[PDB]
Amino acid sequence: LFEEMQIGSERYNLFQGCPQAKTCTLLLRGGAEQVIAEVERSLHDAIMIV
């Protein structure tokens, strides 16, 4: 499946249904710009644990 949706005034093309994919992506939102960057590096640290 494939679908383009304006996630927030930004048009982004999303591939869907890829069980054979050896990669991943994350679209983190935020009230402000530092909420996005803070939650970005937070999950980067969470990924670093696993």
Report the nearest approach of other proteins to the CB of residue 40 (Å). 5
Q: Which residue has the tokens 């994350």?
A: 26
Burial bucket for residue 39 (CB in 10 Å: 0-12, 13-18, 19+): middle
Best CA proximity match to 44, nearest among 23, 29, 30, 28? 28
Q: With contacts defined by CB under 8 A, how many residues of the chain interact with other proteins?
A: 47
Contacts with other proteins, 21-50, as mask; x by CB under 8 A? xxxxxxxxxxxxxxxxxxxx-xxxxxxxxx
Report the nearest approach of other proteins to the CB of residue 34 (Å). 7
Which residues form the interface with other proteins (CB under 8 A)?
Answer: 1-4, 6-19, 21-40, 42-50
